[PDB]
């Protein structure tokens, strides 16, 4: 199809720092 | 010389799926899953060829025992009899006769009792 | 390409007759005055590389 464009981000984003 | 591959491949694969026939879901559909199912079936078998001889012996010994008790004597004494019954040797399966020929059995019990007297 | 001899080793071993290697002893190049004459004396004549190091030396001198 024409149908062919994927610009998948970076992870997605929000949160996490999980105690250091 | 480039090698096509892949005709021999599905040969290997189908060789396995065929062995998986009957298994549930992926175990019979999906090679990656089937190749495992096929192996472990093999593993159990190899094991259970040895188990079979165990399971039946205790099957035999179980019913040898009731019949012995039925003729008023425990399995313990009863094998000891036949042992001591002037040598004499006779399979625990062949004590099959306990189910199909009960006089022959009782008859065997007596012969055993006598040696124990 | 031809192997290159590990040039440093070339300057410290010489293939002998039966295929051995012979070398100069260490410990005889300076700070001598405090060493027994007996010791220094025994360190003059060359000596064969031991069985354990043969492996090394040969790999260093393919064209020995």
């Amino acid at each position: 199809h024409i149908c062919v464009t994927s610009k998948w981000f970076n992870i997605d984003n929000k949160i996490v720092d999980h105690r250091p | 010389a480039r090698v096509k591959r892949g005709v021999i491949a599905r040969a290997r694969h189908k060789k396995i799926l065929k062995q998986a026939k009957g298994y549930y879901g992926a175990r019979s559909r999906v090679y990656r899953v089937a190749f495992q199912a096929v192996i472990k079936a093999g593993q159990y078998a190899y094991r259970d060829r040895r188990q079979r001889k165990r399971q039946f012996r205790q099957l035999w010994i179980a019913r040898i025992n009731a019949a012995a008790r039925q003729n008023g004597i425990s399995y313990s004494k009863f094998i000891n009899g036949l042992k001591k019954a002037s040598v004499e040797i006779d399979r625990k399966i062949l004590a099959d006769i306990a189910v199909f020929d009960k006089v022959a059995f009782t008859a065997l019990v007596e012969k055993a009792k006598a040696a124990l007297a | 390409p031809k192997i290159k001899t590990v040039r440093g080793a070339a300057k410290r071993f010489k293939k002998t007759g039966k295929g051995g290697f012979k070398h100069k002893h260490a410990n005889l190049r300076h700070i001598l005055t405090k060493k027994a004459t007996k010791r220094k004396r025994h360190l003059r004549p060359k000596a064969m590389v031991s069985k354990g190091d043969l492996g090394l030396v040969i790999a260093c001198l393919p064209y020995a």
Binding site: - | - | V6, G8, A9, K11, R12, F13, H23, K24, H25, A26, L28, R29, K46, V49, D53, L56, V57, A59, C60
Partner: protein, 143 residues
């Protein structure tokens, strides 16, 4: 008959392939073992290296000195000379019989056994045992 020839038995060893399955004997790891520098593409350590320890070919002292004169001296066996072609074994001549090599400028004769045909050797040096063998075979040794 062009499909009835076959090579001598044990002249064509198959040769490790490795990396092809459990049965092969050299699957998975391919006889390289588990981890470390020696596995891994382009692994290994250079010759002479023996961990960071000072290597044998460095603990031991140099003792060279290359003669350079030696490089142009040949040695001659008694077994030669018969093959010199002309009964005169000369400064070169041997050279022409391809038993010395052009660049050579010196030569001893060495008791390396077996001389028969009488021969006169000229301009060479010759050991005590070689002289004796030459002479005892009707040979002559003029300088």
């Amino acid at each position: 008959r062009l499909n009835t020839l076959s090579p001598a038995e044990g002249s064509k060893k198959a040769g490790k392939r490795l990396g092809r399955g459990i049965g092969s004997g050299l699957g998975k790891t391919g006889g390289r073992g588990h981890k470390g520098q020696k596995s891994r593409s382009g692994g290994g350590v250079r010759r002479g290296f023996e961990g960071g320890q000072m290597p044998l070919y460095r603990r031991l002292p140099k003792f060279g000195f290359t003669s350079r004169k030696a490089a142009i001296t040949a040695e001659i066996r008694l077994s030669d000379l018969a093959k010199v072609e002309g009964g005169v074994v000369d400064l070169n001549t041997l050279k022409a019989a391809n038993i010395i090599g052009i660049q050579i400028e010196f030569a001893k004769v060495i008791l390396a056994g077996e001389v028969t045909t009488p021969v006169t050797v000229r301009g060479l040096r010759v050991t005590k045992g070689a002289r004796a063998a030459i002479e005892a075979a009707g040979g002559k040794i003029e300088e």
